[PDB]
Amino acid sequence: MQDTIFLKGMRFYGYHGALSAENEIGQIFKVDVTLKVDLSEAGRTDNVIDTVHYGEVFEEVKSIMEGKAVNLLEHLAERIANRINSQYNRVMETKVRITKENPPIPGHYDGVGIEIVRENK
Amino acid sequence: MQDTIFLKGMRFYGYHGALSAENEIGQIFKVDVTLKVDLSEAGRTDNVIDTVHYGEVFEEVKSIMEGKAVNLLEHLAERIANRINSQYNRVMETKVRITKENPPIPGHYDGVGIEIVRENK
Amino acid sequence: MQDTIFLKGMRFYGYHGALSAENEIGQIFKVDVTLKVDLSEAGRTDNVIDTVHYGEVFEEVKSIMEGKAVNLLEHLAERIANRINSQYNRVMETKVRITKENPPIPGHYDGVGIEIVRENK
Amino acid sequence: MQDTIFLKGMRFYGYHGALSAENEIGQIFKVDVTLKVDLSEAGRTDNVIDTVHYGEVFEEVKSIMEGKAVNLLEHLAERIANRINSQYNRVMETKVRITKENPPIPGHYDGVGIEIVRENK
Amino acid sequence: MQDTIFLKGMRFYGYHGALSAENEIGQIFKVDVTLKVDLSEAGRTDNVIDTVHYGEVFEEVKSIMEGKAVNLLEHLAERIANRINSQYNRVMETKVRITKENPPIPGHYDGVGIEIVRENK
Amino acid sequence: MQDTIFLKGMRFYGYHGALSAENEIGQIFKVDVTLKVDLSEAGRTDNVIDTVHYGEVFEEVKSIMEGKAVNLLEHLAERIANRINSQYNRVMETKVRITKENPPIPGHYDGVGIEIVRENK
Amino acid sequence: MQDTIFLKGMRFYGYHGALSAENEIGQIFKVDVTLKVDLSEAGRTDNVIDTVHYGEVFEEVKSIMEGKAVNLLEHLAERIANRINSQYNRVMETKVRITKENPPIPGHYDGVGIEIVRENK
Amino acid sequence: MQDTIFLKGMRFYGYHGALSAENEIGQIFKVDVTLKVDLSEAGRTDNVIDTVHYGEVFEEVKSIMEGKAVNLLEHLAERIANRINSQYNRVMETKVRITKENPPIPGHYDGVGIEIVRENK
Ligand SMILES: Cn1cnc2c(O)nc(N)nc21
Ligand SMILES: Cn1cnc2c(O)nc(N)nc21
Ligand SMILES: Cn1cnc2c(O)nc(N)nc21
Ligand SMILES: Cn1cnc2c(O)nc(N)nc21
Ligand SMILES: Cn1cnc2c(O)nc(N)nc21
Ligand SMILES: Cn1cnc2c(O)nc(N)nc21
Ligand SMILES: Cn1cnc2c(O)nc(N)nc21
Ligand SMILES: Cn1cnc2c(O)nc(N)nc21
Structure with a gap:
């Protein structure tokens, strides 16, 4: 199954x-969040009721990205993945990519x- | 077979x-439309008659994108896929990606x- | 006097x-907000106390951009201009540019x- | 008077x-169309009735850009300038920039x- | 084997x-040309003599892209693929992507x- | 007089x-070449014969940019300016901007x- | 006099x-540094000895941008301006623009x- | 395992x-450096001690990119790959992509x- 639903370049200040x-x-x-879902x-x-509502998916990402400050991005992504996989059964798999375009790293990248x-289990 | 024909960043106001x-x-x-086709x-x-005419493919996409307003992008893409697969036998498979860069979603993405x-069946 | 202080590409969902x-x-x-200020x-x-604090300027812009929904961008910019000119005397003149990259206009721009x-008076 | 109303990156196939x-x-x-107008x-x-409606300005540009094929861009811009200046008195001056990003010129630019x-007279 | 040598965004006027x-x-x-080559x-x-010289690869692409006008891009790419695969044995496979960013197609893409x-055989 | 004719992002390997x-x-x-010309x-x-032909202007720039290697960009621009001003009387003034995006300077810019x-005299 | 010498998008980690x-x-x-200089x-x-060496100008900017941490960008720019104006007489005026693309400001800009x-005095 | 840690668009002058x-x-x-690592x-x-520190990874890349001048990029990437794989066991595989955006090649790409x-062995 190669169908996907996506939200890209989402940006939050945390x-x-x-x-x-x-x-x-x-x-x-x-x-960037990419969800595996059969869209036929x-x-x-x-009928929207036959697919996953992205607005809802964005609010879920936003709630975690703009919430309690944690240490790792790994934690930030695991909570996102685990939170989208729970509330949605049509999502067979969730891919979460987080990027720190301006970390405290002295350089040019x-x-x-x-x-x-x-x-999704 | 890894040959493909493509149309990218196509934009319509619907x-x-x-x-x-x-x-x-x-x-x-x-x-973005990517078609699987053997181009050897x-x-x-x-000879153009040995491949798929993209102009024709663009008109087909345009006709659906600028036509009757439907609800889901899933419907918009299924009609595109199903319409390119019908009129072209050299297309072994059609990939259709639709993006709403500015949906009614309160945020930055x-x-x-x-x-x-x-x-193609 | 050609010195200026600036805030660019500020983006709010309103x-x-x-x-x-x-x-x-x-x-x-x-x-985009550009303020005329002598920075010598x-x-x-x-000493920051000898110039204008942009953070403060951004909060002022944000408060108006994310507040009560008005009709015109002309109103949105006049309130910004008039609000920065009041609380800051070092600002000799305020330039406010507002852009609707995705208005309800059927086209490509x-x-x-x-x-x-x-x-500033 | 430095107030302006603008429409940028407008694109038509002609x-x-x-x-x-x-x-x-x-x-x-x-x-790119930039109109001189006092917006205070x-x-x-x-009240929108106190300024110039851009939608109307875009339709006017579109009508000329997607109409009868002429020779020069100079003609295309003079007709735009002259057409916006007629139907709008609040526009004190009209600036029209037209760009051929892909002319029949053998090179890289x-x-x-x-x-x-x-x-406006 | 996942090593590759590449030339990207190459542009010729033909x-x-x-x-x-x-x-x-x-x-x-x-x-865009991507060649499969073992680079260990x-x-x-x-020692450059242990890998493929891209300059040579670019000249080969250029010679075909700036040569005799043919009909299809499919022909333009087959000649490139077939010409790089012949003169280089370290290239196990050649991928050639050609793009017409501004074809005679009435639209926005x-x-x-x-x-x-x-x-490579 | 604020009318201008322009050629932008012209790129030559010299x-x-x-x-x-x-x-x-x-x-x-x-x-980037910007010429002052009255386009009314x-x-x-x-009638193209009432304005300056850019193709001709590009060939003139190209001939100098792809010719004899000189030392300074200042020389490269003076020859361009002086060559466009000679062959065209409708050009009241020529602006020439040359950029070395990748000079032998150790840094990031x-x-x-x-x-x-x-x-034009 | 409208001739200028420039260095753009210079980036340092400070x-x-x-x-x-x-x-x-x-x-x-x-x-971004723009210097006023007569280049005829x-x-x-x-002869390079008839103009200002940008490499030298970049090293001068770099030395200040990668040196002792100061408070204001206003101080960072005044030292740059004042340092280029001293060592170069052909520079009639120096324009220095500094940008903090990622300041500690909670927002999107x-x-x-x-x-x-x-x-230059 | 599809988890990855990445550093993109890293730029050094060598x-x-x-x-x-x-x-x-x-x-x-x-x-561009992409490391295979299980991030659950x-x-x-x-706990940062359960993942790979990118700062450390960047310093390692920087040390090689800004060090002794070698001939091939193939050598530059093999030393990077081999150096990240040694000091980190959680990295199951290292992908290193190096790009010369401005090589001594006469053309446009x-x-x-x-x-x-x-x-990682
Ligand atoms: C060094 N460092 C700081 N924050 C980090 C994070 O979220 N992940 C990893 N791998 N490293 C980090
Ligand atoms: C929330 N919403 C509005 N339109 C939509 C569409 O076309 N697809 C999906 N998945 N959600 C939508
Ligand atoms: C047509 N239209 C809708 N909103 C507008 C605004 O804020 N300004 C102007 N000039 N026109 C508008
Ligand atoms: C050469 N050429 C073709 N079309 C043109 C136009 O519209 N203006 C100018 N100045 N030159 C043109
Ligand atoms: C319609 N058309 C014109 N040129 C073409 C080409 O090179 N390939 C394909 N598939 N179609 C073309
Ligand atoms: C240092 N340097 C090398 N080439 C140059 C040029 O063309 N102009 C200036 N001002 N400096 C240069
Ligand atoms: C708030 N703030 C922090 N650093 C600053 C600087 O360099 N200039 C100005 N105007 N404000 C600053
Ligand atoms: C031609 N040439 C110069 N440097 C090179 C490098 O690092 N790799 C390859 N394949 N070719 C190079």
């Missing part, structure tokens, strides 16, 4: 980070991040 | 959408959408 | 707009907007 | 051009064009 | 095309093209 | 440069260059 | 900033900064 | 290159490079 200074000042976190029925019917793929 | 307000004002819909003969011959892959 | 549908769904408003003293001293320049 | 081949195949024409009243009132500034 | 008008005026052709020896030694993958 | 190594390997030179007649008539404005 | 946390972690500072002689002669223009 | 002139003047080298524990715990994938 205060997560392992370094105290990080959590104090904050920074923009960019997030919804494509057949044309486009960004540093992680990406996790999590199947 | 009025599809589940919310009444959406259909009223409208918005730009971006579409056409590459051998150099690059865009939300879907992507369907459909083999 | 519900301003002359059309009912607009105010209902909303959209991203991009704002601050450049001489290196990069964006529509306005720009006002207002001297 | 068939204007001095060379026969040009008019036959066509190409994308990008247009509209900024004061918040970002685009070729013209720009005219026309006061 | 006159290929099925339509007479096309061949007359011309247009920019963008080309060259990575071990650091980022570009139309093809992509062929060809193993 | 070997100009004060350092021997520079002239040996070469580099891409980006050029051409806008009135629609978008580019270094010069810009000359030259009136 | 630790300047009014807030302790800022100086601790650091951030990228983008700098250098354009006439083609492209960047905040200042710009100073300083004549 | 003097590597097979041609003498290259090593003399230098150029910007862009590097770190995602579970939220976006960049030339290589990419190596190396498993």
Whole structure:
């Protein structure tokens, strides 16, 4: 199954980070979320109730990205993956990519991040 | 077989959408279409009649994207996939990606959408 | 005097707009603010108290951009100009540019907007 | 007076051009329109009837850009300038920039064009 | 084997095309070439003679892209693939992607093209 | 008079440069040319013979940019300015901007260059 | 006199900033420097000794941008302006623009900064 | 396992290159590094000690990219791969992509490079 639903370049200002200074000042976190979902029925019917509502998916991502400051992006993505997989059965697998385009790293790069793929059980 | 024919960043202004307000004002819909086709003969011959005409493929996408307002992008992509697969036998499979870069979602992201892959039967 | 302080590509999701549908769904408003200020003293001293705090300027723009939905961008910019000019005497003139990159206009363009320049009295 | 109303990166597919081949195949024409207008009243009132409607301005540009194929971009811009200046008295001056990003010129450049500034009489 | 050598966004002005008008005026052709090559020896030694010279690969692409005007991009890519695979044994497979960002197609898209993958025999 | 004719992002690979190594390997030179010309007649008539032919202007720039390797960009721009001003009387003034996006300078920047404005005598 | 020499998008990682946390972690500072210089002689002669060496100008900017952490960007730009104006007499005026694309400001914008223009005495 | 840690668009100015002139003047080298790592524990715990520190990974890349000038990018990437795989056991495989956006190649392209994938033994 190669159908997917996606939300790209989502950006939130948060205060997560392992370094105290990080959590104090904050920074923009960019997030790409790709969900595995079979879209033929919804494509057949044309009824939103046959697919996953992205607005709902964005609010779920936002709630975690703009919430309690944690240390790792790995934690930020695991909570997102695990939260989308719970409330949605049509999502067979959730891929969450988080990027810190401006970390406390002395150099010139486009960004540093992680990406996790999590199947729905 | 890894040969493909493609049309990228296609953009149409339509009025599809589940919310009444959406259909009223409208918005730009971006579409990427990738077709699976064996291009060695056409590459051998150099005769357009040995490959698929993209102009024709674009008109087909345009006709659906600028037509009757439907609810889901899933419906918009299924009709595209199913319409390219019918009129072309050299297309072994059609991939349709639709993106709503500016949906009625309160936030900052690059865009939300879907992507369907459909083999030709 | 050619010194300036600036905030660029500021983006807020609001519900301003002359059309009912607009105010209902909303959209991203991009704002560029350029303030006329003599920066030699601050450049001489290196004391923030000798210049204008942009954070404060951004909060002021944000408060208006994310507040009560009004009709015109002209109103949105006049309130910004008039609000920065009041609380800051070092600002000799305020330029406010607002852009609706995705208005309810059926077409292909990069964006529509306005720009006002207002001297401090 | 430094207030302005603007429409940027407007893009239409037309068939204007001095060379026969040009008019036959066509190409994308990008247009930037900047109008001089005093926006304090509209900024004061918040009444669209105190400013110029861009939708109307875009339709006017579109009608000329997607109409009868002419030779020069200079003609395309003079008709735009002269047409916006007639139907709108609040526009004290109209600036029209047209760009041929892909002309029949053998080389590598970002685009070729013209720009005219026309006061309202 | 996942090592690759690549040349991206290569751009040439040519006159290929099925339509007479096309061949007359011309247009920019963008080309991405990705070659499959085992790079551990060259990575071990650091001797250019243990890998494929891209300059040579670019000249080969250029010679075909700026040569005799043909009809299909499929022909343009097959000649490239077949020409790189002949003169280089370390290339186990050649992928050639050609894009017509501005074809004679009346619309708004980022570009139309093809992509062929060809193993070295 | 605020009318202008322009050619932007023109790019040529040359070997100009004060350092021997520079002239040996070469580099891409980006050029923006803006000419002052009154376009109302051409806008009135629609006759190319009432304006300046950009193709001709591009060939003139190309001939100098892809010719004999000189030392300074200042020399490269003065020859361009002086060559466009001679063969065209409708050009009241020529502005030439040249950019070395990748000079032998150890650092991270978008580019270094010069810009000359030259009136037609 | 409208001739200019320029260095754009220069980027350095520094630790300047009014807030302790800022100086601790650091951030990228983008700098645009535009110098007023008459380039006809250098354009006439083609002798680097008749113009200003940008490499030298970049090293001067770099030395200040990558040096002792100060509070204001206003101080960072005044030292740059004042340092280029001293060692170069052909520079009639120096414009320095500094941008903090990622300041400790909770929001979505492209960047905040200042710009100073300083004549050479 | 599809989890990954990444560093993108990393840019260093070096003097590597097979041609003498290259090593003399230098150029910007862009590097993308993608490491295979299982991130569920770190995602579970939220303890940096359960994942790989990118800062450390960037310093390792920087040390090699800004060190002794070598001939091939293949050598530059093999040393990076082999150096990250040694000091980190959680990295099951390292992918290193290096790009020369501005090589001594006479033409117009976006960049030339290589990419190596190396498993950790
Ligand atoms: C060094 N560092 C700071 N924050 C981090 C995070 O969220 N993940 C990883 N792998 N490293 C981090
Ligand atoms: C919430 N919503 C509105 N339109 C939609 C569409 O076309 N697809 C999906 N999945 N959600 C939509
Ligand atoms: C047509 N229209 C809708 N909103 C507008 C605004 O804020 N300004 C102007 N000039 N026109 C508008
Ligand atoms: C050469 N050429 C073709 N079309 C043109 C136009 O519209 N203006 C100018 N100045 N030149 C043109
Ligand atoms: C319609 N058309 C014109 N040129 C073409 C080409 O090279 N390939 C394909 N598939 N179609 C073309
Ligand atoms: C240092 N350097 C090398 N080439 C140059 C040029 O063309 N102009 C200027 N001002 N400096 C240069
Ligand atoms: C709030 N703030 C922090 N650093 C600053 C700087 O350099 N200039 C200005 N105006 N404000 C600053
Ligand atoms: C031609 N050339 C110069 N440097 C090179 C490098 O690092 N790799 C390859 N394959 N070719 C190179």
